[PDB]
């Protein structure tokens, strides 16, 4: 029926530019406006601007007057999306969505740019024992740390399999043009130190695979 | 030219229950208003367009109304697939700005969290790198903040915070903090906490362990 594709992820560096495509099938981008909103990690939709293809006419958000870049090829019904001099302001979800006043109103699955200056780095995981009055409790909490990687993703488990709950695996964040996250993990008190637990976690990008056995600190 | 105001940041909810969510735009947009719904990962799609016409495949429980300068989007009996993201936007005058957005979540009963903190590991301290890992699991409602001091005064450069989404199993929410040092400046503290504070205490739920005295 209807769809709008537009790109998978896309990597760039601070300082460059992009032009994003949004190419539209199942009708015609002169009939409606071609728009373009960001979103930046757990934020809101931000409407940068839109495009009458049929005119050519633009209208944007004075926040992206500077930074955006709006296009459009009815010859091939499709819209772009021009960003210049990219800041890690700019690393989002971009969707391009057509639709102006009635109940035509469809959107691409969005574009996720992430902006880095950073090329194929592999983690660095190192395990996380506990401050024992915790340890000391009912059951006690462990993890890893997987630091300074890029790009996503990384895959994380425990005891490869054995230990599928009591596991939370934090969403990674990208600082300093490098990800990291965490895996928190709960077992009984009576479970370790005495028996074993080991994460292990994998980046395919890095083609690293590491495994990481939770020992007790001198404590 | 004109903004609006979303109205709560957060609903927490029941199945069954009924709720609304409202825009004031700045300014007046003569119901040129439409109401999307954001599902965890997925894109925006059209709820309700020009204040009350319901958008295509849309069900009853759906209703738009206001006029002027207040909107209201109301879900009559909450069905499973409704919790997710809202989001308001105006199409009278460019820019066609959106609302802030609301997250509608399930709601449990309030529950503290469990919290644990994790010294830096050999592995890092040979590298050059000293991290301090808070864990601040299972909690709700989902508003928190937590705090790093060393030795007593607070710090906040260098904090990595990552929250999970609402537990699909429990409902409950989770944050990680990690305090990345040096290994200069961790030999050359003692005290290292990290002080959550959340709705369930007038004290921070606060935890740490002292370099040396191990």
């Not at chain 1, 373009?36 to 931000?46: M, Y």
């Not at chain 1, 009591?166 to 009576?190: C, E, I, K, N, R």
């Not at chain 2, 709700?140 to 906040?156: F, H």
Request: hydrophobic share 30%; aromatic share 10%.
């Amino acid at each position: 029926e209807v769809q709008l594709q537009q790109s998978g992820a896309e990597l760039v560096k601070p300082g460059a530019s992009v032009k994003l495509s949004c190419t539209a099938s199942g009708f015609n981008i002169k009939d409606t406006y071609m728009h373009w909103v960001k979103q930046r990690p757990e934020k809101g939709l931000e409407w940068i601007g839109r495009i009458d293809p049929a005119s050519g006419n633009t209208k944007y958000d004075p926040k992206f007057q500077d930074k955006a870049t709006i296009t459009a090829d009815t010859s091939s019904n499709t819209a772009y999306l021009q960003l210049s001099s990219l800041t890690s302001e700019d690393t989002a979800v971009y969707y391009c969505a057509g639709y102006d006043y009635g109940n035509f109103d469809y959107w691409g699955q969005g574009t996720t740019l992430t902006v880095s200056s950073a090329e194929t780095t592999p983690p660095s995981v190192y395990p996380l024992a506990p401050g024992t009055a915790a340890l000391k409790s009912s059951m006690v909490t462990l993890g890893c740390l997987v630091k300074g990687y890029f790009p996503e993703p990384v895959t994380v488990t425990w005891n490869s399999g054995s230990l599928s709950s009591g596991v939370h695996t934090f969403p990674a964040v990208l600082q300093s043009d490098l990800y990291t996250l965490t895996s928190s993990v709960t077992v009984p008190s009576s479970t370790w130190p005495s028996q074993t637990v080991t994460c292990n976690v994998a980046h395919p990008a890095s083609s690293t695979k590491v495994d990481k056995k939770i020992v007790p600190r001198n404590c | 030219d004109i903004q609006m105001t979303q109205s709560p940041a957060s609903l927490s909810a029941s199945v069954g229950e009924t709720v609304t969510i409202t825009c004031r735009a700045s300014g007046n947009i003569h119901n040129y208003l439409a109401w999307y719904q954001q599902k965890q990962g997925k894109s925006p799609q059209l709820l309700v367009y020009n204040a009350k016409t319901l958008a295509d495949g849309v069900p009853s429980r759906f209703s738009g109304s206001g006029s002027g300068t207040q909107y209201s989007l109301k879900i009559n009996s909450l069905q499973p697939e409704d919790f997710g993201s809202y989001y308001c936007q105006h199409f009278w005058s460019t820019p066609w700005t959106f609302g802030g957005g609301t997250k509608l979540e399930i709601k449990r009963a309030d529950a503290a969290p469990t919290v644990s903190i994790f010294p830096p590991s050999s592995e890092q301290l040979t590298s050059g790198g000293a991290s301090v890992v808070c864990f601040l699991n299972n909690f709700y409602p989902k508003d928190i903040n937590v705090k790093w001091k060393i030795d007593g005064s607070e710090r906040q450069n260098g904090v990595l915070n990552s929250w999970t989404d609402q537990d699909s199993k429990d409902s409950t929410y989770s944050m990680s903090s990690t305090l990345t040092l040096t290994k200069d400046e961790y030999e050359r503290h003692n005290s290292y906490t990290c002080e959550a504070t959340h709705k369930t205490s007038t004290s921070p739920i606060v935890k740490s362990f002292n370099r040396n005295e191990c």
